[PDB]
Structure formats: C-alpha cells, structure tokens
Amino acid sequence: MQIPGIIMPGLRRLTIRDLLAQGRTSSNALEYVREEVFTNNESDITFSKQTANVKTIAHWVQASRQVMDDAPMLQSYINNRLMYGLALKEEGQLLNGDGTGDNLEGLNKVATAYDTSLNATGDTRADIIAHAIYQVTESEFSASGIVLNPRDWHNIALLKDNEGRYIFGGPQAFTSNIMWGLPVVPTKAQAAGTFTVGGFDMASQVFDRMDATVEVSREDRDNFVKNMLTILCEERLALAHYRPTAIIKGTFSS
Template sequence: MQKIHYPSDYGRKNAGGADDKLELKSLLDKLSERDSEIKQWCEKATAEIKDTGKIASETKSALEKLSEEGIKSNARILELEQKLARRGGGDEHVVKSIGELMTDCEDFKALSQKGRGTARLNLKAVANITSATSGQGGVGVAIQPDRLPGIQMPAQRQFVVRDLIMPGRTASNAIEYVQESGFTNSAAPVAEGAQKPQSDISFELKTTTVKTIAHWFRASKQVLADVPLLQSYINGRATYGLKYKEEEQLIAGDGTGQNLLGLVPQATVFDDARRKANDTPIDTLRHAILQVRLAEYRATGIVLNPVDWESIELQKDSTGQYIWVNVQDGGQQRMWKLPVVDTTAIAEGEFLVGAFDLAAQVFDREDAAVEVSTEDADNFTKNMVTIRAEERLGMAVFRPESFVHGTFKKAA
C-alpha cells in the first residue's frame, strides 16, 4: 500500500506545493555545482595518474563522496518531480487504505483511549473504495497501478517519396515554367555551300499553383496544461496528418479543385508491348526502367506498394532458394541498382519508375506549422483549445516522359 506523506514528513507547510518547487530548484543548482566540482577532481586525478601512476587516496575519497551525494540528490529530484507531476493543479493525490481510515476515525481513537466500545467506519460516506482522491480524506485501492511513461501510439506510415524529389521554395502562389513540347531534329551532314537543314523546337508555358493542406481538432485546455507530453504528442499527430496526406497528393493527386497534380497522373503509361511471356514483376520493372532510358533519362528510383515488394522478395528459384534477398541480413531495398521505396500511398499492384531528382520539384510556400488558440467558437467558456496544422506547397513535373507508371499483370 502507498504510504501517506504528511507535510510534517518534510518540514514543509504544503507538501507537493511551492516549497517542493523551491527545493527542486535548489537541488538542481547544487547538482550543477557538484558536476563542476567533479570535473575539477577528475582533472586532478588525471594529473596524478600521469605523475605517479595512481590516484591519491584523498582524491579517490572525494570522488566517492561526490558520487554518493549525487545518487541521493538524483533520487530526491526524481521523487519531487513525480510528486509535482501527480499534483497537477491541486493538492497531491494520496491514497489511504481502509485500515488507515479506520485508525484515523474518531470512533477508533475513542476506543483506543477507553479500551472498550465499538468503532464503525462508513465507507459509503467517505468515497468509493476503488477510487483515489485528492488530499488526505479519501480512500483508494490498496495497490495502485503503475502508469507507464509515454503514450502508446498507433503505427505510422514512413514518409519517403518527398526524399526522392528535388526540393525548392517559392514566395508566390503559383510557379510558372517553360516546357519543351516538341522537337524536330533535322541535323544532318551538309556539303560545303549547301543549304543547312532547319530543326523545329516548340515550347509551352506551364503553371502549377500552391495548395494548402490543413486540418484541426479540439482538446481540453487543462489536459494540455497539465500533461506536456500529451501536448507534444498532439502536435506530432497534427503534423503527421499533414505529411500523410501530402505523400498521397505527391503520388496520386488528381489536380482537381484544391488537389495537387501528382506524379502518377502525369507519368507516361507503361508500354504493355514490352511485356514478355512469363514475365515476373522483376522483369516488368526492368522494362519500365528501359522505357525511361529510351526517353533519354536515367531512372533514379522505384515506388511500390509493400505487398508487391514482399512478393518480389519472396520469389524463389527451382531449388527453393530466395532469389532477391539474403534472409539473414535482409539486404538493401534496391532493385536493378535503384533504391526501392515501399509505401501504402501507392495502390497495390501498381508501380512508378522515374528520374525523380531531375524531372520534378516540390516547392514549399509555408512549412508545416501548428497553432493553438482559445479564440474559436465557444472554447473560452468550455476551457477548450483549437489546434490547427497546415502547410502550403506546390509541385512541378518538368519532364512527364521521365516517369513511367503501370500495373503488374497477374499470372494466368
């Protein structure tokens, strides 16, 4: 059972209150001074070893004493921090067992003095015996549960597609660029004095606009104030939500409304004529790399769904040996000398191969930011806060033919 710590235990008026904070600050200051003192003694010990080959007994004793004091101080600091964390905005939460409540009640004290009579404790008049209460008048369970540190978060997607694309910044709401739309190459050997052939090049002005990705949610103001860890957790989830949607937009945004125009809608469709009988997904990806190369670009990456990447890694030869991976160390996520990015942002059965670092660029207008405000709707009267996260970005695909998108055809 948890021991009840009364104010007299520490000689303070309010256990867990302002005095605890003062003591904590004093201990931290002393700890800093102790660290400086240890540094000086360590320097002295180093000099002694250099001069005599050993540490003097006086130096050794001083270091041992400082170490013991540090252990005690750290233990006390931990105790104070835990008390202050439990305390929150009110008195320290303490729990009394039924036996402690019985010995503290007036009936029992009278019984002890007189040596006869009856002592009765009405538990219903005190509190539910399964709940902890604030202050020293409550009753709780005899054994308190341990609260594990941190918050157990659900699984999160790893964002990797942006890393393949060339980064950039913009101070405008739109990005314009000139794209070559046609080239007729008439270059040829020419005899001296003969008319030179004319080649034709046509250009097209392209524009991509900056889009906003945002979301918001509400949380209790007290929760944010009392649990800093929860506050940072919420902020993290806010930015995670942005990056989750961003990756989907970069890959498959359809460009309508407020959507980005992603890589897949702008990519060249895989040429099915390149497929051969009995082709595996490994063969299909090599054909796609060739298609990029024939467009005079060199592919720099492959994007797959994790399910398709697993099926590739699990392929075996006629003897049952894995073809693509050493199961002992896993190997690198590479295929045909290119890095493989597996993400659920691309649909199962699809692939994207391209010259990511050359053919496309992401332009950040405003980096992801999280804002918290009480000035929203009825937040003030309900002690709520609104948390909003947003970012603004655009993407330009300069050379659509350098990307190839296709599907893995199922074997018949």
C-alpha cells in the same frame, strides 16, 4: 497561435518526399518551360509555359480544452502528432495527387503510362519493373528508384526464379531494396497493385511557400460553446513536374 519549438520530419521510413528536388518560393504560383510530349517515331516535340499552383494542405485534431490550458508536455505531444499526419497527406498529394479540384498534381497523374507492348509471354512481375526501368530510358534520363507497395514488393522480393534460386534474396535488406541495383521505395501511399518508376531526383520539384507549423485555436467555430479545441497544422506546397516522360505508372495484371 504560438511557436511550436520543434519541427519533426520523420522516423522509421521516409521516402516519397526526399526523392524530389526541393526549393522554396514566396508566391501563389510558378511558371517555367518544360518538355511536354516527345513523340519519337517524322518526329515532333511539344513544349509549354506550364503553371504550377500552390495549395494549402491541413488536417486538425480536436483535443480537450484541458489539454492546452495545462499543457505540461501534452502540448509538445500533439505538436509532434500533427507534423506527422500532415506529412502523410503531403506524401499522398505528392504521389497519388488527384490533380483535380484543390488537390496537387501527383507523380502518378503526370506520369506517362507503362507500355503494355514490352510485356512478353511469361514475364514475372520483376520483369515488368525491369521493362519499366527501361521505358524511362526512352526519355533519355536514368531511372532513380522504384516505388512499389510494401505488399507487392513483398512478393517480388520473395520471388525465386524458375530454378528456385532466390532472386532478390527476399528477406535481406528492407526499405533500401537495391532492385536492379536501384533503390526502392516501399510506401503504403502507393496503392496496392500500382507501381511507379522514374528519375524523380530531376523530373519534379517540391516548392515550399510556408514551413509546416502547428497553431491552436480555442475560439474557432462553435468550439467555445461545445468545449472543443482545434489544433490546425497548415502547410503550403506546390509540386512542379518538369519532365513527365521521366516518370511511369502501370498496373500488375494478375
């Protein structure tokens, strides 16, 4: 359709995407050479010329015919609503990406599973993320941040040690969460009960093929016969995962 003059990234809290390295491409796939499995014990190291396919994320809204024909400001209205919704599913593919059919391969699928052996009789949830922050070290890279579920972070932050003394100072700073001196990501994307820690800033990279643009058709499908309108917001992403060992995913067993 025609040029949506505005491209709005986000508001209140933006986290999952801004953690990864970004760069653009102009192809339908990407090839590179990364380290696959480092079996540290006789030790061995696996390598691969892995392929990273690009997909087409897109969701649409079916506003009235009237909406576009008039479109005094109701156009810009919806134009800022698709760019936002597309970012939600984008944030969902970049993290909890199933890796299945057409879905992207998300941080959580690639990630190396948390080492259950680090847990010790009587560790607090906090202790676990701590252990986790360590497991990243066995890769030989520094952790970048902690991605917990808003609810879980709000149970960990409000955690007082055995002595009642406030550990994280619960209330204090929201969204930045300098847990262990490291910034935390409280996103609703992260499924409750699941936690992710790694050195995102250089373990994976997002590759843009086409900027998020919003187009609107009035002659798509049986719309012209049902008085309907499709407002497609397309986008082509390709999430690479240079180092899996630098990312970890586990589960709180309470």
